[PDB]
Amino acid sequence: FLWX
Amino acid sequence: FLWX
Amino acid sequence: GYDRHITIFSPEGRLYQVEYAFKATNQTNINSLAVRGKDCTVVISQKKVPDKLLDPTTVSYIFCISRTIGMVVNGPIPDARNAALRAKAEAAEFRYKYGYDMPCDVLAKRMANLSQIYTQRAYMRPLGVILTFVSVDEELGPSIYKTDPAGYYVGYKATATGPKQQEITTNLENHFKKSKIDHINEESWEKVVEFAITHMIDALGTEFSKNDLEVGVATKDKFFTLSAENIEERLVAIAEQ
Amino acid sequence: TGYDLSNSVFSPDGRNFQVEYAVKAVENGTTSIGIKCNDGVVFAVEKLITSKLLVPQKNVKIQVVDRHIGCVYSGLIPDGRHLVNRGREEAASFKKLYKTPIPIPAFADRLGQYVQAHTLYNSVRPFGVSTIFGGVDKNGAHLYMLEPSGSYWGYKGAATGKGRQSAKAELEKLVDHHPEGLSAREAVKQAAKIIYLAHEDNKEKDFELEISWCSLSETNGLHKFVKGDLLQEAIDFAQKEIN
Amino acid sequence: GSRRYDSRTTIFSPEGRLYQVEYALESISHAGTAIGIMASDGIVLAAERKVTSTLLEQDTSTEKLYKLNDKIAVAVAGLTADAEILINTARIHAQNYLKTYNEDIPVEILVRRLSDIKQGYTQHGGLRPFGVSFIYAGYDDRYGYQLYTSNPSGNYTGWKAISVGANTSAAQTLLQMDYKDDMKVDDAIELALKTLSKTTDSSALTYDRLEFATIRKGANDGEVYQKIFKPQEIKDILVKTGIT
Amino acid sequence: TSIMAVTFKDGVILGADSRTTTGAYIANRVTDKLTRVHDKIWCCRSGSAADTQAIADIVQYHLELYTSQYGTPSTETAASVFKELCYENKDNLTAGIIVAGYDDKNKGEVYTIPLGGSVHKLPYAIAGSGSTFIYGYCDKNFRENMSKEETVDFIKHSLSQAIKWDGSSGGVIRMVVLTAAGVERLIFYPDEYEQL
Amino acid sequence: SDPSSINGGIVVAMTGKDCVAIACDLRLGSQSLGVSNKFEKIFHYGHVFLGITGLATDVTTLNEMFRYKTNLYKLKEERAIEPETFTQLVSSSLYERRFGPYFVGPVVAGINSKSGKPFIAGFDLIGCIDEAKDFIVSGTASDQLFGMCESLYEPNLEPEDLFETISQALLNAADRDALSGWGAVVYIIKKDEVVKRYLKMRQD
Amino acid sequence: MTDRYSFSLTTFSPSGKLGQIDYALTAVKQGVTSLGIKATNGVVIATEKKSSSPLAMSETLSKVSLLTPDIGAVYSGMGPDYRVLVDKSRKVAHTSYKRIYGEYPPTKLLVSEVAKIMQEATQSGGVRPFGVSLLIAGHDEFNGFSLYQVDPSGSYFPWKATAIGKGSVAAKTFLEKRWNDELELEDAIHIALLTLKESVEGEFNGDTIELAIIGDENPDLLGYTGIPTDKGPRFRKLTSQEINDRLEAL
Amino acid sequence: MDIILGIRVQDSVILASSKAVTRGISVLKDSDDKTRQLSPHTLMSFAGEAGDTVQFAEYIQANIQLYSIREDYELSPQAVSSFVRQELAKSIRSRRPYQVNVLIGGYDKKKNKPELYQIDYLGTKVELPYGAHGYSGFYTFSLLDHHYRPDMTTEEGLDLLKLCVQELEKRMPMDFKGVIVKIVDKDGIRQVDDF
Amino acid sequence: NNYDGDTVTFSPTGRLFQVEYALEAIKQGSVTVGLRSNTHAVLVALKRNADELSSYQKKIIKCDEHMGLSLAGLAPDARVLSNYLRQQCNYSSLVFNRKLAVERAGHLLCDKAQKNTQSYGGRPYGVGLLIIGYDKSGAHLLEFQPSGNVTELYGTAIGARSQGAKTYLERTLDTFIKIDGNPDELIKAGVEAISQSLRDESLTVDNLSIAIVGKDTPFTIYDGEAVAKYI
Amino acid sequence: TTIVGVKFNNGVVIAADTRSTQGPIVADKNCAKLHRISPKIWCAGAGTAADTEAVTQLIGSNIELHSLYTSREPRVVSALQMLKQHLFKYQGHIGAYLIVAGVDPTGSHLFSIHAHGSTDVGYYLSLGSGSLAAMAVLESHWKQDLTKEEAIKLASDAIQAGIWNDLGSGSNVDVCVMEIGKDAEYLRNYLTPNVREEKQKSYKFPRGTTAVLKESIVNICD
Ligand SMILES: [Cl-]
Ligand SMILES: [Mg+2]
Ligand SMILES: [Mg+2]
Ligand SMILES: [Mg+2]
Ligand SMILES: [Mg+2]
């Protein structure tokens, strides 16, 4: 799960 | 299950 | 004889509704022509505006399908616009799903497969149109691929469509016998357009004003149509030679 | 033969006889015209007064789509209403997604593709109407005429119905005599005259004139009906020209 | 609309016959003859291939005789393509029954369900019936050896010996003449070939134009074996009986 | 994430950091968070990378199909398509998008679409976790009708502070300039912006 | 309420010189309660052997399912399915139920009739293939079996020696698990003969 | 609207003929000649490339199509019908086999799946039969090399050698004289070119002839190395040059 | 519902089923028959969730009765058990599974052998010489392990069953109001009226 | 001839014969008259009986408190269309707390009738309707035809010998339009109108059916002894 | 699991470890985590082993059909787009974390895909439990304009970092090199630095050690  |  | 009303085989193994759809092709009485340069593909079509009340800018049988692909239609405008909208939808979806611009020959095959279904399924009539697709494919280079109501399609060195197609075809055949090559050996698209118009004038035996022609040009990474002034500039060049 | 008994069947000519038969229903209908002007379009229609019992000004034939498009049609009136209902759904879904009101060319193809769809199957009947429509968008004024086949083009002037040849002849003269352009208020008066001249081909019953217009200067780019003083001024202009 | 082009495949004649069933049976009557003969100790399935060509691959071919499960086989007469649709359905129906009851499907139950599918195409759906007649040869522990036939009508009946396809009239007279109840498999093999030999439209009956199969209890102790005869095995059985 | 779009005299400029984090681990330190939906309509992505990518991909598809039929879409039209996806799927999306585009009629325009799926047209917009730290700075320093060099400095100084205080933001400062001239990509490295 | 450890049981497969062995316990219980001492977990479809541990209703269901599928395979292909192919069929079938799976630990064993190569494979519950030269283990005493196999096993054992190794591997693993044991079965599989032996083990 | 044609367009006539199948076979008869010859160590399938126009590029139109790495197909009759059958044939080889067994289907079973599609067009509502006969050449480990014909009815037969379309009657008679059970693949290619010359009228060269083989594995055509079991496709389309080489020693 | 036992002997299968139907702190009935005859030589006892038990039993009974009429033939006990197991195996992955556990006692007329099948609500089938469901097993299995012999008569089987019921009445917490006993043999199904 | 098999087929002259045959069913139907002033709108219907033992087919249907129609042709089709109007009138009330405009009522009937004339399988409605109502723009009278054509009129008549009443109303137009705040006098003008369409038969007590709607009058139907006043 | 991708001047290289685990137990001591989407497009997978295998084979099958339909060699961006649209549809319920690499007419490409359907671009990437050990090595030694032999060394070194330092990774190093204008070379067990030492003892039992109750011949034939 990647965030920005 | 199997994990790699 | 209801074998002539729907797309089922006649005793002699023919589909009459496909054959009659082909005759609907020439109902507009317009001749198209496509040729390939080194860097470009040029398509030209006759533009006949008989009614004086018509807005001539809105009278067009050339369509911008994608940024790269252009399409000219020989047949009635309703079926032409039917085919154009579907081709645009198919080219947009292809890019979304597969992450690269739909090739000219792949779109042609897709539209041909759709045309084939109308010849096998009874409830759908064939479209009375011949679709000429043009682009500068990033793999195959300058490309001409043509579709008909039968669901047939093939690539072309050059091609012509309409009532006086045979005269234009033999005119182009004779040139490629002489030149001994698969294309117009020319640097600029401007001169490939001049070639296309010159050889249509010779075949049809008629002269053209700026409002008698409609020109589409495919280069790398864009296809665009020429305005009346773009064509007029081009006609002046031919005349002065 | 029997090629004309079913819709979407090609004759050996390459023709769809059922569409050509639908055109006969259009030719039978009352006269309707469209005039493109400087900064907009003007629509006018002939309303045959069958009886004294018809309430004047209360059988409106011209229909609005969104707020900026006008539609008028000749032939089977219900078929026209069905086409406008579709147009209103197309214009609503366009505005919903793209925010901007639907451009006239975009709108024209939405009707075009729909009418064309009714020539693809033997389970549906072609539309028994030629539809004259248009309005004002970001790119300026557009006038269109749509036929049972799904064929449509942009027009300087458009006419359909029983008095189409009379109206076309009168439209061609305006195009020749005003190359720089016709003003919105002028087009309204000319529209009145052309309906009165086209009424000669339908002169048994006397009629009721109905005019509408979209103009960037006069109606602020919105579709409005011509009523009251401006309507009576246009009727008087037309009455003077026939005499 | 589309009403104009509807054949109406599922209607009665004024006489009370189903046109499309009658015409499908007329179709099957031109197909290669298939014979089934049931003996006390096995069943024979014989079938004549439709006018063979000399360049047809004979050994890796299956036109007439198909296997439904280890205990049931069918002989086909009519459209091969139509038959293969019904065979794949039958094969699945057999495995569905085995999965549910942990027992091999009784022959009649499989035949009824396949016949019920054909019946459907004659009563509803507005489609053409399957141009196929079957001879079912099978064994189960209830009735033992069983021969059945089904036809496009979806009607099925049981037999001691039966023919389908071409020259059934002539074939059924010859079987009715020489059949008896205490017959052995080896005798039934001979009858089957002698019948085809006389009813054939060909000049002489040869190994390359025949498909042949037996369902015996000729395995080792109280178990059934299916034998789909190889080209060389048909050539041997044709010499042994003295037809060539 | 730290993203912003600023309108100026000649058009609009998009700015973003390059850091993508899962927990406290930097998964990608050279992320391109400025994405093309049309030739001169771009967007800034903050929130779920998966969600913002999926949305951006669909919009690019819609505007390509729009262009085929009705020619070049307005920046407002692009923002409307973004809003439609974000609003109608608000229950399954974590996406804060800034839409920025250059028309020739309308010039530079900036639309911000927060979590709700609401649309807000602004002279400039800031978004992402890093934005909280530069509300004060950006409000005090932003002027309308700035020059290109002024707007590049304003974005560089702003994102420099956002990056300094936000752990979630860092790496290089990417910028995309939208003017009549065309599309220009700019990059600025830590060794420059850190010591501003 | 852990589906994989309600009924209990184990399967182990090993490779030898031109032979394979597959073995399983016979226990079926309901947690603490032992119910059946005859519940075999090894089935065969032609010359391909399948052992299944886990929830017993799924062991039964999958056996009935693969019998169904191998029967249709044989009718259409006109030949018996091979171990490598069957392995792929098991994997396809299990992953078909990816978001509602069969609570099983299957183990394929057999000799390819064409190449004569010994083959064994294991699967997870979602259908991931675990191919191995040496041995595959499955069930409630998988840890124990892994420990026994990894120490006892050596390559290229003769059928009679391989029998002793797999038997001692299963027995000693089963005796350290509460939910496994209550009898055992060992299949010794050569190219064209298969011996099935019932082991004597402690009945607690 | 909607497909109101939910009834068969192919029905039995009083004579027992299925009209639309008979007429579909008539359309195949009109089609250009294609043939197939089975050798001991391979199969050859060949056809004339009837060019619609000399401006057309006959390389773009492929009459001989790869279905799987070890199976090829050629036709006589209506090309468009052939094209969509190849698309459906390639997909069904995946969905109904490879995605289940992790290997490509054997020739007979893929042929059976194609036959099923063509049979359905014979019985399903509101469709005409396919106006093509296919020749499908293929290899698989357990059956070896095989050649099949598939007719509009959905019927298929295995062949040692055969021809379909225009001059099939004469071509079949020619193949009967030349075919033996000891033919090597090179001998079968030689006979295929001799047979095809009889039916072809105009130009006879590598640019007007389309010819492919099902032969040895081609590691060079695989596209990768490192997996010993993967040895590459048995289907290979002969080049315009490779055909012209064999036309000199004709 | 609670106590259902089964004992397969030489020539018959014996099913004992508790008579109590309890809801809350009230024994509503003390004469309940927790069994249905599926066919003349096949009997199924059932125990589990209220409503589900009878609804499942009667549904199976209807399907076996339908098969018997259609084929004019009685399905083997093995065949019926396989059918019942598959229905429960389907049930467990349904929206609302049947929470019913069953014993199927039958006499196979073709084999001339009694057969007892124990099937839980998951669809776990086993053939047994003796079976039980719920807490009953925890007492009866060890008792039958000891006293059971495979060649016993029906009368010996009933005495072995009395020994089980006595042990359950002694050590079980709940009053199950005795059992209804039924014998399945070559002559079909009959009920022991005095137990 | 060859072009009257279904509604989806145009004739070579551009006619829909199935729609024209549906129109014919109205002419066979019993006469009904509609007329209005500025304050009130009136329906007068000649009801038809099978014989002297039978009841008289009810011609007038209420749609809302402020709207209702009379029918001529297939009564079951009138029931379908009247039921549709009741729902549209009811939808307008519940959702918008708004009485449905008599003009919109017409537009909705038009669009419903049209869909049956362009689709395969369906058939045109075999009934004509006269819709009266009082809304926010005063009194209204509509004439519905199953072609889809809806027309707003001061007065009209449909059914057998309707031309007699329609000619009378065309003459009387100037008189009856100004009968404002007088229900009884507007009905009398309607009863005198329908009398011009009578042959051999005269208006009796169980024969005549009158309905009225107006400014301070909900849509109410008069039958039996209530209409004896107007004979 | 430890998988890396490294870009070099004329192509891309991907490497992976060979350890499969259920909890703390090692199920497969030599497992192949390198998958073929197409001949010149290779995939390395971490996360749910079944999910990475299934998603790889599905897109691989669809890419082959697409390649045949378009008469064109497949592109990495096509495999990437089809994967990320499929993974996004299932909202992360398919636990496939992939490094996609390959060569096509467009050039050489290296991407990573996460289970939720996010994609990344890079010259060097690492995924799996040993990614942090691998990425440490990549960040230390990676430079622009790597040669083939340098990229293989860097990639295998990054995997080794995982093998030794990460408990989830171990055994051997599989490598696949995709170079432009050349066939992709799959180097199965490129390094085997974890060979089991000779056992102290043979546990081969005396024949008859196991007690047997019954023997019987099984019938495998018809
Ligand atoms: Cl397609
Ligand atoms: Mg058709
Ligand atoms: Mg930071
Ligand atoms: Mg133990
Ligand atoms: Mg114990």
Which domains are seen in chain G, by residue range?
A: 1-204 (3.60.20.10)
Spell out which chain E residues touch chain J, with contact meaning CB-CB distance below 8 angstroms.
Answer: 1-2
Tokens coding K62? 């669809």
3-state secondary structure (DSSP) of residue H24: helix
- Pair G181, G202: CB distance under 8 Å: yes
Given K1, K2, K18, K56, the catalytic residue? K1
Can you read off the two tokens belonging to residue H241? 């040059």
Q: Ligand 2 centre and the CA of C18: distance in Å?
A: 9
Residues of K in contact with B3 (CB under 8 A): 1, 20-22, 47-49, 168
Domains of chain E with CATH codes? 1-244 (3.60.20.10)
Q: What are the strands of the beta sheet with K107-113, ordered from one edge?
A: K34-38, K41-47, K96-104, K107-113, K119-121
> Rounded to the nearest 5°, which phi and psi values hold at C234?
-70, -45
List chains adjacent to chain C, taking adjacency as at least 3 C-beta pairs closer than 8 Å: D, E, F, H, K
DSSP string, E133-182: EEEEEEEETTTEEEEEEE-TT--EEEESEEEESTTHHHHHHHHHHH--TT
| Candidates F70, F74, F80; nearest CB to D106 | F70
- Smallest CA–CA separation between K92 and chain G, in Å? 13
Q: Which ligand is nearest to the CA of F24?
A: 3
Intra-chain end-to-end CA distance of chain J, in Å: 46
Tell me whether residues I75 and E109 touch, CB distance under 8 A: no
Angstrom resolution of this structure? 3.0
Strand residues in D62-156 grouped as ranges (E): 63-65, 69-75, 129-137, 140-146, 152-154
Q: Residue C134's domain is classified under what CATH number?
A: 3.60.20.10
In H, which residues are within 8 Å of D124 by CB distance? 1
Query: Domain spans of chain D?
Result: 1-243
Domain residue ranges of chain F, discontinuous segments joined by +: 1-196
Range of the domain at J169: 1-231
Contact D150, D16 (CB under 8 A): no
Both tokens assigned to E12: 């009665």
CA dihedral J161, J164, J166, J172 (to 10 degrees): -160
HEC secondary structure over chain G: CCHHHCCCCEEEEEEECCEEEEEEECCEEECCEEEECCCCCEEEECCEEEEEEECHHHHHHHHHHHHHHHHHHHHHHCCCCCHHHHHHHHHHHHHHCCCCCCCEEEEEEEECCCCCCEEEEEECCCCCEEECCCEEEEECCHHHHHHHHHHHCCCCCCHHHHHHHHHHHHHHHHCCCCCCCCCEEEEEEECCEEEEEEECCCCC
Number of CB pairs, chain D paired with chain J, less than 8 A apart: 94
Residues C68 and C221: beta-carbon distance below 8 Å: yes
Give the Cα separation of F39 and F36 in Å (integer). Answer: 7
| CB contact (8 A) between residue K116 and residue F25 | no
CB F127 within 8 A of CB F107: no
Catalytic positions of F, please? 1
Backbone angles phi, psi at H50, to 5 degrees: -65, 105
Whether residue A4 and residue F31 make contact (CB cut-off 8 A), yes or no, is yes
Q: How many domains does chain C have?
A: 1
Task: Report whether J155 contacts J169 (CB < 8 A).
Answer: yes
In DSSP terms, which residues pair with G122 in a beta bridge? G107, G130
Distance CA J16, CA C176 (A): 57
Contact residues, chain E, for D6 at CB < 8 Å: 4
Q: Do H158 and E56 touch (CB under 8 A)?
A: yes
Residues of chain J found within 8 Å of residue E5, distances taken between Cβ atoms: none
Contact H80 C173 (CB under 8 A): no
Beta bridge partners of H18: H12
Distance I102 CA to ligand 4 centre (A): 28
Quickly name the fold that domain F1-196 has: Glutamine Phosphoribosylpyrophosphate, subunit 1, domain 1 (3.60.20)
The 8-class DSSP code of residue D119 comes to T
Provide the domain count of chain J: 1
CATH T-level fold of D1-243 = Glutamine Phosphoribosylpyrophosphate, subunit 1, domain 1 (3.60.20)
Name F152's Cβ contacts closer than 8 Å, sequence gap at least 6: F13, F175, F177, F186
Sign of the C-alpha dihedral computed for residues J185, J191, J196 and J200 taken in this order = negative
Sign of the torsion formed by the C-alpha atoms of F188, F191, F193 and F194: positive
The pocket of ion ligand 1, defined by CB under 5 A, consists of C 113
Total count of domains within chain H: 1
The CATH number covering residue J138 comes to 3.60.20.10
Q: What tokens appear for E6 in the block?
A: 């509807």
Touch between H and A (at least 3 CB pairs under 8 Å): no
Contact D150, D137 (CB under 8 A): no
Strand partners, G199: G184, K212
Elucidation technique: X-ray
CA distance G142 to B2: 14
Tokens of F76: 């407002």
Nearest to F46 by CA among F9, F89, F95, F12: F95
C57 vs D105: CA distance, rounded Å: 12
Q: Can you tell me the distance from the alpha carbon of H130 to that of I192, in angstroms, rounded to the nearest whole number?
A: 71
Name the catalytic one among D1, D30, D31, D50: D30
Give the nearest chain D residue to H5 (CA atoms).
Answer: D123
Instruction: Take residue G158 and report the two structure tokens written for it.
Output: 């003769």
Domains along chain K with CATH numbers = 1-222 (3.60.20.10)
Distances (CA, A) of F62 to C93, E73, F69: 9, 58, 11
Residues in D whose CB is inside 8 Å of some CB of C read: 2-3, 6, 8-15, 36, 105, 109, 112-113, 115-116, 119-123, 143, 149-158, 168, 171-172, 175-176
Q: How far is the CA of H155 from the centre of ligand 1 (A)?
A: 25
User: Which chains lie within 8 Å of chain K at 3 or more CB pairs, if any?
Assistant: A, B, C, F, G, H
Residue F49 to residue F26: CA distance in whole angstroms: 13
> CA of E18: how far to CAs of E115, E124, F160, G121, in Å?
16, 12, 87, 57
- Identify the domain containing residue I11 by its residue range: 1-195
Contacts with F66 from chain D: Cβ below 8 Å: 98
Q: Which of K91, K118, K129 to mutate to test the interface with F (most CBs of F within 10 A)?
A: K118
Q: Which residue has the tokens 């057998």?
A: J160
Cβ of A2 within 8 Å of Cβ of F52? The answer is: no
Q: Name, in order, each residue with C-beta under 8 angstroms of J4's C-beta and a sequence gap of 6 or more.
A: J11, J17, J18, J21
Cα(G23) to centroid(ligand 5), Å: 20
State the residue range of the domain holding C190: 1-241
Q: Is I75 in contact with E101 (Cβ distance < 8 A)?
A: yes
Please say if D30 is a catalytic residue: yes
Task: Tell me how far the alpha carbon of residue G171 lies from the centroid of ligand 4, in angstroms.
Answer: 8
Q: Testing the interface with C: which of F39, F68, F72 to mutate, by most C Cβ within 10 A?
A: F68
Q: Find the residue in G nearest to B1 (Cα).
A: G124
Backbone angles phi, psi at I135, to 5 degrees: -75, -25
**What range does the domain containing H185 cover?**
1-249
Q: Contacts of residue J122 in chain E, CB cutoff 8 Å?
A: none
